[model samples]
Target chain A: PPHGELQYLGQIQHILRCGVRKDDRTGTGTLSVFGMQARYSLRDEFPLLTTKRVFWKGVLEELLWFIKGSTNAKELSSKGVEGDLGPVYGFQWRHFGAEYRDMESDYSGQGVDQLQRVIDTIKTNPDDARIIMCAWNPRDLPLMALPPCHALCQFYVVNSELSCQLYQRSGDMGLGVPFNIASYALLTYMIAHITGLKPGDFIHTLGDAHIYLNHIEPLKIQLQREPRPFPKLRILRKVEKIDDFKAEDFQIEGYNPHPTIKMEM
Target chain B: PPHGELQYLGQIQHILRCGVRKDDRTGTGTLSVFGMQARYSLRDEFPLLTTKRVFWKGVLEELLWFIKGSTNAKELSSKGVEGDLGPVYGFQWRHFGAEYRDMESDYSGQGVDQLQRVIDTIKTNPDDARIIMCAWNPRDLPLMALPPCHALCQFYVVNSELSCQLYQRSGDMGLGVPFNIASYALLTYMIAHITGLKPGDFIHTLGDAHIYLNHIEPLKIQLQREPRPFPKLRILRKVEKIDDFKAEDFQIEGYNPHPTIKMEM
Candidate 1:
């Protein structure tokens, strides 16, 4: 295992040792620490958490939905109605300047396609520092199901390697963070694959990191368990377009994680 | 200097040692690092650079410009014509959703007053995780003099102390990073003061941190110098609103910094 997993564990320790108590909307309360960052490299292996098994399928399904510029949560599963999640991450990424209606509306050539722009910039002008994707549209806050947590992301390319950094506004430390780490790492890998560049690093930065008060004990037990090595992600075939990637096209090899710890979202 | 300046120095060293060489728009080559984060505590003292004298007046003037929601750089110096710097930091901050025409137009209640909203949220609901201000408007990029480098910022409140995290998409490490450090730190203090909370920390997260080729030598010499104690900022007057505070109402005491080292922007 890379020291990246240890960095995640150390953050948990720091929060437990020095975090402040704060009340949330859920009434469960939390032990919160404000600012934090962890860097996970995607050079050869993926950053799937081995401390506890993250929902790998869920990660793929949600990512594919975002890639397809989906606004419906129902489309997230291989599983409705006009289950519109509104202008969330995918909508903001693909159709930022478009008028969003229900999930079924076609937003072709409407808004600035940030994901496509990023890929183009990486291929042509790799040094452009303005290659960024932002999902937190203050103007569209009232039109969304929930505000984006992993809000702003920036891509950097150098020496033919692509790295991504995500600035998350808030994170549920015990449950959501580990999954997010793998999620962005996988995003970087997929983008790099299509762009013909090596994956360098995935930097995860958080604004307010909190462990729900109820999940602390379970996390304490999780801390005692040693981290197994992270798995290597294999892209089953070449996908030319971002939206063309499907769940079956990806596979994780050598992922041996501890038993999943269920916690309320 | 509370080891904060050391962190700045260490970042420069890390970039020099392991950074990849890349070419920028200026035709100036740079040593670039992908992602970096540093935390500076605002418990009592300000994070004014001790290794070199940062332009204190410039910091205050520009920040005051940002607070006043003035996009015209001419207004910064008390000094034109249209001298409109375009819809930059202040415009995006105060009038995010407003239609921009020129610098002289009155924008009262025209857009989302994010600064005021943040202050209000801090006072009303301190634990709300959505306290953020963003300046990177992809829709208005052509209308901007320059794309925002220090693009997005978020505020967190806990234990009756306010902290801020700034996510800058790109930073010129040697010339601009130190000044930006003080700028956001000062911003945190000003907001905390108005919100009746103590300033806690200023966390800076950078996406692409680079040292221009010409700056490497000067920065190397700077690395040799010993850091002095940081200065303390005192609010000279009781300013209730964010815009009510003037330049003279602020003072930086105990600032004994090293002599200036000039580097081209």
Candidate 2:
């Protein structure tokens, strides 16, 4: 029984009890701890948090945008997707160098398409240690709506089993972590599904894992509620490429959560 | 009480017992696990490993090389610093963008100096959430002798106290872990000292942390030995610029350990 939702819950609980209170860039003060590791076996089940309902549609839509190699912030809104999903994740994955939109030097697409490269590597040489997809481009930092929090990612393949490891430099436990987990887990599933490999694990590592001051009470409410079973992700349609996923193609089943915890971003 | 060397020792031991047996790029097998973290509080004393003698001088020399932004692996040997210290780290730290030399263009000095930006950030906006120093440059991936293993680092300054978090993609548990800890801790001390801030905790997060099968027996020998107290690091001379540092400027004190455990790289 891989209760990843509860495991992630326990992590925030640890941060809440032991973390040092610090003021952040968001102007929201956070109770912060430096390093934390959370593991989710994507093989057993899809790790969507059962403590509270995760924004499943938003996660899928944003990922689809990233997969399409689109970096524009307005793309989300155009797709009937609400909220500012920002210009980092998918932008970095697809057109990383192109995101370096400055006051001069009309855009450089010199940055590698990390998703494409990873897919190529997965198909060609799965044993290569250099199969990495990085989102932390310092050059594109200024142009980005926000710097990458779930930063670099490395993929490992062994005996045709695919595992993904993500290095998140900062984590906002209450509101952000669930979305981060679900988005990346779904990514692992999508990639694995496309590459003809079984999903092994999503090994999540964090640097500044924190719970904001305002979200602590809500997180505590999340803590009190017992975690239900994680839902399984099913990709109903077969897509040849990473970008072929539609919002409807990916589906979650057996998702019965308690209630949504309102968190202020 | 909070001895990081012993804590690291216990981690490798835990890995040796519980980690999965997997083949690796080195042609040697590894007992591996993903997503592990270790924390060392730099507020008390410097965290140099005492279980066995780490190449203290080499560690300092390598950092000095990186701080100066020299990506040449030959520079380490030119300074009489010997080992397979690789061509990354300080190279990527100081001359990050410069390493994108794949014969398409002349790469003299175009890379962003991450260490300089970090120092500037510490001086100017100490509370800034974007105070990240990244070493994982995707553009320079194919040209590098070895890509960054101890990849990206983030610094946090709170109340005149400086803390650093390192996100390492891979860790060699037996030979490399101790050196990695000592190197980063020394770095934290050096940066903190120069910036006039108290050195805080060093939060180490790992992705694919592993121990090679050949070194497993030696590690067991290492485990058998009773751990010793960590030695304190000393900055023998003060230098204005980070690049102004020499190998002779760094010194270690009270480093008494058991017989050196021999293991192949």
Candidate 3:
């Protein structure tokens, strides 16, 4: 059986071998490929990377923060910034067109709640192809602390299973990409559980799949290790509402990953 | 060299063999795959599929309509509808947030012109990762005549060449997919020409890539046919802006495609 993490490894290898050298916003030069897609099946198991230990704690907290529609980076303990993220993923998901004030302002019932609509549509019209949530609001881009990398995502429900495809404009292959795979897979699991369906596949589609020049050596070292089996996510309680779940409610079982390799952001 | 249209053929083969049978909004049963990506290079030739004749006239006219930001379907001679397409692709591209009245309403400088911004960004900040134009407006989806299939597209600039990745939520593989491939490829070519760069690649990423059950036989026939060399698109005259280009300004040269297979839409 092929380990799902091989896809990630293959992407890294492809970038190293054929990617064009490009300079980025961080002045961190990168070997970048323009388009890439990888599918990690969420069937009967989670897609947590087994090649290296991913920051599961940060993934859980940040997702919970987005679900709560809190765009303030200060509210997310995982994100170090004390300033507002300014209508990022959370804001776009929950309050898409709401007028933006400071992070302190109330936006209750002010904008379109795309996440809630997606859930509603899944329950009512599972066959609908337009079950999408977008974070790349061009009108609000100037106000953002940083533009979204995972800009848009769509959900597909078939044969009583739910799958999701995320369109990310940019990715940092060595570090952030692994977390993203796990994050979206976990998201599919949560939504599937809520909709009374099994988790299917999580497809990560990228516009610019890149490896920062500094992280390539670390990635090559990490790639030398064999992949362990992916972990299974156990949701402890029956959750009805999407917002009712907590970090403690879920647990990762049988995660035997290789030693962690730190990569700079 | 591998013909670019084989990707389309391979997708059809995959769907026919491994796709799940699913019902859609059109009451057409489909053999569907949740996520798929195909990359077609625009280095020296256009990807007007040689396996079958694509509707080049419709593709050119509709794209010109979009560049002009005309939401009225009547303005597009290719489309049968005389009514408004109502903030579909053109409106979202040009006037994202402006209060949308009827198709006759003037929207000059009313909302964010994403198309113009994309062209400007290509000229000024080519390496910037967020050159995206989206047609999936959640706030205005209810007003649209039909939700966009080719919903969002992002442009990437590297090696002084322009590449575009489109995240389409749904595609009709037999009839519409060929036209879509040509449409976006032409769009990229126009943008590259205007920006004084070479066209790189057109990456078509899909959420629910399906072939209607009725069209399977025709597609199978298409699969059996040998693909010819893809045609090249030529600009008869140099255009300064995206909107300045017309249908007559472009020419499709050496398009020796197979006999047209008409699939009911």
Candidate 4:
């Protein structure tokens, strides 16, 4: 049974049917609902959406960038990153609020390296309730190219299993939500692998979850198709540090999906 | 129907029966499950808990203090705030990371005034998804007597109705979760009243939702009793400014509940 991916598709169905149309951040209009929650168990299967082919490379590269505590777009652009990522997830995840007032300000590794700190805490004191990392820094908003949509996430440990809960302020149904699901699930799995804990659930919570007006027809097409089996994610490298892992380290197998769904971001 | 409150009780029952025992922050053991979500509608009725009496005055006073941007526990203690009321909600809501580095560091108000900013953005640009206020500051974590449990919250507007979602990193089921439900519901109602929008649902999301070892028996007793109808909250005075209203200004009508449940925090 494809329970995890089914829940993801079910919420999508609910949103398409019930979401109200509204003006959004980009000039493009959206149909949105206020609050939604989705859960996926990483132990059973990877959550790459089967209705539409998910872009896994972009997901891994972006995550690796954040783990490296980078604040520049040049790093991503150098990797032939096509779309706009803009100092979003990784910048906030690592060096949150490590400010250099102007564009040319040097990163002296000034801000708190939150990702490393979280790993250290998870290994050292597993039950600590403050195992939360946040990227919605109020002070750094002006300097950020684009403020975080998937802002804060908290990790929990019990019975030597790790679970993550993300609090995203906004989610795009057609373009962003599906990728967010797989990306975070992979992130939780990787962290669990490194920390010697079994992968548990990845709970994603959204505030103003929306579908863009232009993507409604494509999502309708997605709804008509049944979801297939989730791919198995294999991380082959024996990496000690978080940075040692490269894109080549990941091997995605047995993923058979419908054609890739396209939407304007 | 007690739909929202029942969901709250159902989660507690699920936890008491199925939760894993773990060591927690205060040295008291906990029965915890990782992720949970509960929603309450402000338009239907106020979410003042009808299972057992909720502290309405403390909730109102505490909320008003945050709207006023006061960060002193002395203020609450002097004004008869009953609960622990540590540097919890108000302090962070108003002045997030607003710090004087040391005791005598120049106070240029480095901390962002998140409460005022959210209010302003709601009125000026209601469609903005970045209209979020957070209390989980990494730099100011140690200074806080207790790190925020219900740390981040985001607001949404559509069709002139305002709703809120709270990202609570941890929730104590027996004592804290009930109050948090009523508290945020009332907060949403007040903000909607002042902002000329209809009150919408209050979505509360939790990370490590748990029950304290000492409170289980009392909660069991409390849970066996049937819930009564929720009371209507009336703001007798027209509070032009967010901070203008006092605790006496709120009148909760027809709140008849079972006997109070006592617990150690």
Compose the digit string of candidate 3's lDDT tens values, residues A146-219.
23334678999989999999888888888888988888888888899899999999999999999999898999
In model 1, residue pairs whose N, Cα or C atoms come closer than 3 Å (at least 3 residues apart or on different chains), thus clashing, are none
lDDT of 2 by residue, B70-117 (tens): 555676787777333334565567655563443223444566667877
TM-score between model 2 and native = 0.86
- Among these predicted structures, which one has the highest TM-score? 1
Off by over 4 Å in 2: A71-88, A99-111, A136-150, B70-88, B99-111, B136-150, B236-239, B246-249
TM-score of each: 0.92, 0.86, 0.91, 0.89
Give a tens-digit lDDT track for model 3, residues B187-228.
999999999999999999989999999899999999999999
Docking class of 2: acceptable
TM-score of chain A of each: 0.92, 0.88, 0.93, 0.88
Cα RMSD, each candidate: 3.2, 4.6, 3.2, 3.9
- Across residues B1-265, which tens digit of lDDT does each residue of candidate 1 receive? 3478899999999999998898887678999998899999888789999898888998988888888888776686563116787777788778876778888889998888888888987888898778877776444476333233347789998878999998888889998899899999999999999999999999998998899999999999999988987789999998889989888999999999999999987
**Cα deviation of A78, candidate 3, in Å:** 9.2
Q: Relative to the true structure, how large is the alpha-carbon lDDT of every model?
A: 0.84, 0.75, 0.85, 0.76
* Better-scoring candidate (TM-score), 1 or 4: 1
* Candidate 3 wrongly placed segments (more than 4 Å): A71-88, A100-107, A136-140, A143-150, B71-75, B78-85, B102-105, B136-140, B143-150
Pitting candidate 2 against candidate 3, the one with the higher TM-score is 3
Give me candidate 4's interface root-mean-square deviation: 4.0
Worst 10 residues of 4 chain A by lDDT: A140-149
Model 4 spans > 4 angstroms off:
A70-88, A100-108, A136-140, A143-150, B69-88, B100-111, B136-140, B143-150
Give per-residue CA lDDT, model 4, range B1-265, as digits (tens): 5556788889889999999999886577989998899888887578888888788778877777767655456666676783333345555565555542332234345556676677777898899888777665444457433233346678889999999888778888888888878777877877887788888888988898999999989888877977787788888887766666777878888888777777876
- Chain B, candidate 1: TM-score: 0.93
